[PDB]
Design an enzyme around this catalytic site. Structure first.
Site, short mmCIF file in Angstrom:
data_model
loop_
_atom_site.label_atom_id
_atom_site.label_comp_id
_atom_site.label_asym_id
_atom_site.label_seq_id
_atom_site.Cartn_x
_atom_site.Cartn_y
_atom_site.Cartn_z
CD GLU A 163 -2.89 1.39 2.30
OE1 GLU A 163 -2.58 0.87 3.41
OE2 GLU A 163 -3.78 2.27 2.20
CG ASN A 221 -5.09 4.61 0.08
OD1 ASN A 221 -5.90 3.79 0.49
ND2 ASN A 221 -3.81 4.58 0.42
CD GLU A 253 -5.65 -0.17 -0.53
OE1 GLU A 253 -5.83 0.56 0.47
OE2 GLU A 253 -4.86 -1.16 -0.53
CG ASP A 283 -8.93 0.90 2.76
OD1 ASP A 283 -8.68 -0.10 3.49
OD2 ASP A 283 -8.32 2.00 2.84
CD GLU A 340 -5.89 -1.43 6.56
OE1 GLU A 340 -6.25 -0.67 7.51
OE2 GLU A 340 -5.97 -1.08 5.35
MG LIG Z 1 -6.02 2.21 2.46
#
Ligand SMILES: [Mg+2]
Ligand SMILES: [Mg+2]
Ligand SMILES: [Mg+2]
Ligand SMILES: [Mg+2]
Lengths: 380, 371, 392, 389
Positions: A163, A221, A253, A283, A340
């Site tokens: 990420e 993102n 995301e 997400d 996460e």
């Molecule tokens: Mg994220």
């Protein structure tokens, strides 16, 4: 002590009176411009300018364009407006100076009252949490860097993807997280701008990883507001082409919440990216009401659950139940699940016991700048 | 007299050489279809499909295809989005023998339909949208004080169309910005002619609320004014009261820059909230405008008259202008004069006109005034 | 950092849920929830402190702002976050309005409610926590229960405030105003009970107590040859009952009074927020021949159009208009437009909150004609009021 | 282009005012306002035709979807506009769900209404005015009040069974109108109205005592099939609910464990905490509790410190979607996984064909309802059904 003031004032008598009032109080040099072209030339060869002054009531479209020149030069810190700003548009005007990446020091009317020029100088040197001006300048100046957090497999060592996270090298505060700038960027519509700096950096990193024989998928993102943009998808491809990286090398995301309030036309970009072959993650899954209804209606290739599920497992068995349910869900739709915020071994094995494949957290790796990541990747 | 491009590739083509009377071209990718130029494009859109997404894309601005059948029946779940995606390129979407069913459909394709998204994207790309002009006039005498700039579509089959037939589309597809710049420069060009005829007349452009959030609206306006060698005050920007309500948080930046530049700013459809008088107080518009229903309800409703009076007083006390819309007759023109109104728009003076009609309207009016 | 305290006011259960779920993740401390005024004031009464109130400034089921006003008098609330990022032009004015309540404006939450944004506002709060005024549990804000007993023990008295001509001070009429003879707190104005009564549907009860004290007084004035009409505030909820107009007429007959001896006043916001069924009572009062005044006016014009015929014989301008005259001179333009409006409708205009003579002269200059305020007369109990009504 | 009737449903009075103000400027016809359901339904009954309903699917003091459902059956409403652009992913489902009611969907209004967008939706409406309709006797408010005040409502029972076998586990108690003129009616023809006129509770206490009479028979027979009664969110209000339920169980010689209460996910979400305390109370008492109509997501799980539910029930639509929406099979899988991990039961509703009985088995489902097994029955038929088992 000693300051460097630059006054932009067309009307020559006004210029005369202003500069003369500035000699009395301003310890240091003072420069003079009869219009935009002459000011932009005082800039074209000078050092720092502590304060720029111009008159926005009298002119007008010159004054604005100047300030941008002031802005573009990177050479000016602060602004005094040489007319009094109307109480009703105070914040509007300040905010306008600050989106130029200039600080608003203050305003005052011609001929200047000498005590008022003192107040603002005292205030000015007295400035020796980040502001809007700070964020804009930081962004206009390549201070924002991409960070990398790997998506690993829970069992084994694993390395599946990463990420891409936004960080800011502050010249005085150092590395900072989105909360210290996303507010500002969100409020003033700079998110797009930040996105493209980072997307470019990210693809450059993606190349170095392809050069090294590594299938590390890079996830970016996307803010919902961008989702409304006419040419986002077409621009992501143009760059993927320019970089000779394939769609599937890359993932975008979007949170569940933000997907809720996303603009009517968000789908036009989403079908694009899906066809293209880019991976699309939903997400912070499990945030609205109709989460399960959403996965149904859009073929997301990944689901991510956040820091709080992991933390709550031990003390709250319902989390475990929904982790398991989600595992089933991802399992039945043939997509990946990332959990996460894994910080401990206890947490890790439990996740496996439950059925989860991918994770992120401080157990494996905290977010990292390009090189530490590349090194991290050379090793698995 | 019928063209087919397509892009198993042999099953449909012998099924086509059995159906379509005309010239049948063919290609294996974008690059080879992009050369296949020197009516209909059938398409596999699980090509997944960046190649599946190069094709249509030259096709669209090439002006080389009109209509699109897909070579695949895509997953109904994003069937709508996929259709939006085609149409957003300016290409018509027919569908997914059902085959021959749609090929005579549109080889033939009378009280006819509302324009498609594809229609609107095309017209936008092919210069079919034109600025019209409606004069603002001095009720006392016969103007001429100004003009509002409006959007009309010179549609190839349907004639002139008002925004009801295209604006929904542009709003939902984030195309209003693109129309604005087209009409704005058109209007700036007309403003040149107007100066050149000795008639400096302010021109007002409607601004869509979403546009006020755009990073460089005001600065672009600024650049364009410089390009046309026009001063900021020759131009005006109108935003509806409700629009301003729903406006993005960044809107004030653009508004303040316009105000500081010296362009006019009109609050249009004044009185449609909820906080109307408070709002006028917090931002210095140079003009407010009343909806045409105010003038229409003047015979029946003494109240309508009252609010006109009130607003007349409001504008005179703020030192700004008031435009009353909908002036359709002379008796409502005189009633408006008793009430203290000064500026107006309406059919009695002139409905919206294309540039040359408007210029000729202006000449005539000036000639009338000088006698 | 600690046990942050967050109260979310949200009407719409799906927004509430989204917001609360996001807050649970990120907020260290308790998340409190209110769907309506009742939960909200209950939560407030039981809490010792509420660090951050998250508020939606237009709800169907709750007046967000009125809760804020009440909350500001409680002592218990640091800061406000708004969950509607609305109306750019009116944003500063909205901030200041919050800030004049005692409250600290933290920021707006988006209708996304992104987790990142939330933490920003928390860090922001947390950097201000010390500089903020102490939270204390002010004992002067009577509880719901305590309000409910006062209203059951006859301790609410009518006061009367004269409406007078601006040149002179000649008497024209008076508004009847609610005061609380609090057993141990003294004499309280509506700030200290009205909001609670509104929220627990006790206004109708207060009105019937005050309305008859007032008719008594109107009777005494008649008897004195003093044609002073008395005006009573009717809260929008009271318009709920199909029989209000009929109950009011039975009572007027009972007191030997013609409808014309009396006036009723409803705020603009109230008139706006009422169902048509409910608006039918005003039509009735209007036909009976009562005066009607639209109260706290000044916001715009669209309230003029709710009913076929405008039933109002009077308009009253919101108190804040006089205060803003110096503070924000563009408000003088609204005063002018409203003067022009009233004249064009052939109805009267009262301007309230007139405290200094400099205001009086400016109001006369703008065309105003009738006024209320401290400059002319404070709210009086009946006998002071009656004695006041001897002097012409 | 004239004499339209437009109905605006709007909870919030400033938004309603803005809309109505815009609508009057542009609509040739009448603008009818409803601030709630009580008003929407009344306007509906007086009206005879409504060209366009403008409706917000996310209101606080009114259920916009409920009303649209009711309007749809009355056959008095042609088109819908939505006052929110909400949720781009779920938009096509929403439009379909509306069209499946039999209403034509016109579009969204920006929820501070533009004039030029209204006349656009207006021109769209005009274009589509002569389009082919679709699909039926709707009784009035008065009719429902007297029907209810006159003991015309009956309890029906639907068994809950093991998907393999057909073994009886339980039964849902259902409402039916024994209407003097138009026959036996389901809730489609009365509940909405009762819901919006505060009549549900009254219906409940009737059917509860009917259902208790039936449980008590089953119990005297040593046949312990628990009966589940639907509870509407509004009834969670009265803090006396559980006392009153407890008092009846006593009057009928039954324990709390013999009986179960069902509540919808959206019902549960719509409820003030003051009300959920009442749900807890039933569970502390030992009644069973189910969440009806489940499957949107997971947010419902975290409203109480303790999850008080022993059962989860999916909606009919799921069985139906299995074909025309294959992805939904994953959610069933997921709910099965959830229910199992929570240690509660999972009931699937609306099972018609044995074909779809087979797939549910695959997916992991165990308990069920539907016409494959048993259609809702009057007391005595159900009493005999149970006798078989
Ligand atoms: Mg994220
Ligand atoms: Mg306009
Ligand atoms: Mg009053
Ligand atoms: Mg049920």
């Amino acid at each position: 002590n000693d300051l460097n003031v630059l006054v932009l004032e067309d009307e020559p008598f006004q210029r005369l009176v202003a500069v003369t009032a500035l000699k009395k109080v301003v310890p240091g040099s003072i420069l003079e411009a009869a219009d935009g072209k002459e000011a932009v030339a005082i800039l074209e060869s000078c050092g720092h300018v502590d304060i720029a002054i111009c008159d926005l009531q009298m002119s007008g479209m010159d004054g604005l364009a100047f300030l941008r020149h002031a802005s573009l030069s990177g050479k000016v810190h602060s602004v005094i407006l040489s007319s009094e700003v109307d109480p009703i548009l105070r914040q509007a005007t300040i905010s306008m100076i600050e989106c130029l990446g200039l600080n608003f020091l203050g305003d005052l009317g011609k001929p200047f009252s000498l005590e008022r020029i003192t107040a603002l100088l005292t205030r000015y040197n007295a400035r020796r949490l980040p502001s809007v001006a700070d964020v804009v300048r930081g962004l206009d100046n390549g201070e924002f860097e991409a960070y990398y957090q790997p998506k690993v497999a829970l069992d084994g060592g694993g390395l599946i993807g990463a990420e891409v996270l936004a960080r800011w090298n502050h010249p005085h505060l150092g590395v900072l997280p989105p909360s210290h700038f996303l507010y500002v960027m969100e409020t003033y519509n700079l998110v797009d701008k930040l996105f493209w700096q980072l997307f470019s950096q990210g693809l450059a990193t993606r190349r170095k990883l392809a050069q090294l024989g590594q299938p590390i998928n890079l996830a970016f993102n996307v803010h919902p507001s961008q989702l409304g943009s006419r040419a986002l998808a077409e621009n992501i491809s143009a760059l993927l082409t320019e970089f000779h990286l394939p769609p599937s090398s890359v993932m975008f995301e979007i949170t569940e919440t933000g997907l809720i309030s996303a603009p009517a036309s968000s789908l036009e970009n989403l079908v694009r990216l899906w066809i293209m072959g880019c991976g699309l993650a939903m997400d912070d899954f499990g945030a609205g009401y109709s989460s399960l209804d959403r996965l149904c209606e859009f073929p997301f290739s990944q689901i991510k659950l956040d820091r709080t599920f992991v933390q709550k497992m031990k003390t709250q068995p319902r989390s475990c139940a929904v982790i398991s349910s989600v595992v089933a869900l991802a399992q039945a739709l043939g997509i990946s699940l990332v959990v996460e915020g894994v910080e401990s071994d206890e947490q890790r094995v439990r996740l496996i016991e439950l059925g989860c494949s991918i994770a992120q957290g401080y157990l494996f790796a905290r977010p990292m700048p390009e090189q530490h990541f590349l090194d991290y990747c050379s090793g698995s």
